[PDB]
A paper describes a structure:
3-Phosphoglycerate dehydrogenase (PHGDH) catalyzes the first step in the de novo serine synthesis pathway, i.e. the NAD+-dependent conversion of 3-phosphoglycerate (3-PG) to phosphohydroxypyruvate (PHP). PHGDH diverts the glycolytic flux towards producing serine, which in turn is metabolized and incorporated into a variety of biomolecules including glycine, thereby providing a major source of one-carbon units for the synthesis of purine and pyrimidine nucleotides. Type I enzymes contain two additional regulatory domains, the ACT (aspartate kinase-chorismate mutase-tyrA prephenate dehydrogenase) and ASB (allosteric substrate binding) domains.
Here, in order to better understand the substrate and catalytic promiscuity of human PHGDH and to identify other potential roles of PHGDH that might be relevant in diseases, such as cancer, we have developed and applied functional and binding assays for PHGDH, and have solved structures for the catalytic domain in complex with its cofactor NAD+ both alone and together with the substrate analogue L-tartrate. In agreement with the deposited structure of sPHGDH, two molecules were present in the crystallographic asymmetric unit (ASU). However, while both molecules had NAD+ bound to the cofactor sites, L-tartrate was only present in one molecule, allowing comparison of substrate-bound and unbound states. In both domains, NAD+ was bound in the same way, forming various hydrogen bonds with the enzyme. The substrate analogue, L-tartrate, interacted with both the lid and the core domain of sPHGDH, through a network of hydrogen bonds. L-Tartrate formed hydrogen bonds to R235, H282 and A285 of the core domain and to R53, S54, R74, T77 and Q291 of the lid domain. In the absence of L-tartrate, the lid domain, which otherwise closed over the substrate-binding site, underwent a rigid domain movement. In order to characterize the movement, the two molecules in the ASU were compared using the DynDom webserver. This analysis suggested three structural sub domains: a fixed core domain (aa 100-287), a mobile lid domain (aa 9-93 and aa 289-301) and a hinge domain (aa 94-99 and aa 302). Interestingly, superposition of the two conformations with and without bound L-tartrate showed that the lid domain had rotated by 29° upon substrate binding.
Author numbering:
A (entry chain B): 8 to 306
B (entry chain A): 7 to 306
The structure:
Amino acid sequence: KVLISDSLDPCCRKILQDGGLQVVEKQNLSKEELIAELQDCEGLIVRSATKVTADVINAAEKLQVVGRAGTGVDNVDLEAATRKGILVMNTPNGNSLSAAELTCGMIMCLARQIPQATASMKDGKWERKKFMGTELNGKTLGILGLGRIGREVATRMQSFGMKTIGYDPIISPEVSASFGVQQLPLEEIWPLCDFITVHTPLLPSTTGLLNDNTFAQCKKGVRVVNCARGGIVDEGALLRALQSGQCAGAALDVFTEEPPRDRALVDHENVISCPHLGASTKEAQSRCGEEIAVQFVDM
Amino acid sequence: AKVLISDSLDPCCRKILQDGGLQVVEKQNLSKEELIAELQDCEGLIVRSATKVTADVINAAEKLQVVGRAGTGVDNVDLEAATRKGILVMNTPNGNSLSAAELTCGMIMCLARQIPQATASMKDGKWERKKFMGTELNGKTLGILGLGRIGREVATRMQSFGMKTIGYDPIISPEVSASFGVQQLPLEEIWPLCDFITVHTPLLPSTTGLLNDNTFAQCKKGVRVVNCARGGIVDEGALLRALQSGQCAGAALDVFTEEPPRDRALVDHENVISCPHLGASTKEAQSRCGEEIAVQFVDM
Ligand SMILES: NC(=O)c1ccc[n+]([C@@H]2O[C@H](COP(=O)([O-])OP(=O)(O)OC[C@H]3O[C@@H](n4cnc5c(N)ncnc54)[C@H](O)[C@@H]3O)[C@@H](O)[C@H]2O)c1
Ligand SMILES: NC(=O)c1ccc[n+]([C@@H]2O[C@H](COP(=O)([O-])OP(=O)(O)OC[C@H]3O[C@@H](n4cnc5c(N)ncnc54)[C@H](O)[C@@H]3O)[C@@H](O)[C@H]2O)c1
């Protein structure tokens, strides 16, 4: 028995039922209502609106698995789940293309300053000289993290003629070569790159992966994209690089603190940003419905 | 041997001219008055967009034989007045194509994810997630009108995103277009299929208002439109009315029937993103156009 408590694609319920599970769909429930529905349930599927708090988890006696049809666990008390022996699942594949597409958009925006040009036009200005940009053809793109999103960015930007190099400690040079990315050690990467984009998880080993030492090994006027997680690019180092001109531009979808209380990066003229929109598409939201229902049916 | 450069060009342009054995004067920004005086002893003028080579100027410039534009088209040159006085006109139809294609693709992505709007919101100190829901390009259909230099480069880039690419061009066979992945159909069958449409034609009487009230009404509700070609191909009044009703969900404009535009309604619309005619505005394209036009002059 599974409860679906948020508004999901009807393609989730079907698969569950084909797997041999009983389903109940229903949203916008109160705490009390939610706990009552769960009384006979070993499975719950949410997206963002349903708040799977310690209080709900502790009152739901038969529950063994909670699925979120998104990335992260923002609306789930992961710790209370673990005290109770409940497994928490996510959908590591459903968001990949939306995030890769944003990344590529960010790259193009940094080459040509579209978002600053738009702001200028809307202020009534006509600023030709100011927004002289860069042609991507023949430029080198460094891709750090060559998993699901990394390789999708690579084949897209190869169609603009960009040379794609990268680094990933787990993906073989043979696998990367099949999507046209030549692997090298980090220290050989930095000096080659006109653009660098990051697609790694956030771990102790990736916290400040770009920092003051790595920025000094980059080409003068490098442009940087972070559509992964806040913290992979050290934010103080990035502002220093933007102040000196070592970094000519940055695009940020994510921040160490969200919303970010320090505004100096966001306010810089050469920085473009979004409020963590990498998974913010109808299509990504729906693939996630399928992805999580299918894991539950395998379970 | 004397040639004036009257607009701001890549410094490779004069260099080469000088290597050819010509004297050069770079004096961008000049009144009708100042320009005619500079030309008095010149047989060559190279412009970009700001200098207006009018019938007036041409008729006062006694010793001129050749005018070069470091761009496409001849928008700031009176070609009928040059030809009457027997003057040949030069332009650079190749140097800019990839920069224009790249901007076009940037514009498509910006419209799908509202990147310029989201940046403005962030810089206004807000965190507005809910509000910036977007569209994934994969599996969407892109209409491409004009399948020459730029149209075909746009096609191959956007095919890498999984967009289905359809289009129309009166000169390119359906066999040729199919070899770069574009399926040619009559215009009337294109309009209803498209999630995005982008134009890449010259401005001609047949392309003036190629999108208009009648064609917008045959489009899918919520179509998104890009004009990185010339102002006027998309009828501006028809566009604003399509944005107002929701028939068009979004537009991106790099060019205007008047530049800079005095009517601000399109530019001010929340679902419109725009630039000040930046399609050729990259160091590399300006360097190539500079070279392209100087080389023609040295050959003369
Ligand atoms: N912006 C958004 O809203 C959004 C949406 C989806 C995913 N993401 C994020 O984007 C990132 C990438 O996701 P993915 O699905 O491609 O992940 P993945 O797990 O498929 O691949 C990640 C890769 O990162 C590599 N990596 C780890 N440490 C590294 C290092 N030190 N140097 C180089 N590479 C290293 C791993 O070897 C792995 O191959 C994640 O942080 C994810 O949370 C963000
Ligand atoms: N900065 C900028 O924004 C920028 C820069 C360069 C060029 N441009 C413009 O973009 C446009 C295309 O440039 P190009 O080099 O790609 O031109 P091109 O000559 O290589 O191609 C133009 C194509 O449009 C086609 N065409 C003609 N009539 C048509 C119709 N009625 N419907 C559909 N297609 C039609 C022609 O058959 C031709 O193949 C031009 O208007 C050019 O001036 C803009």
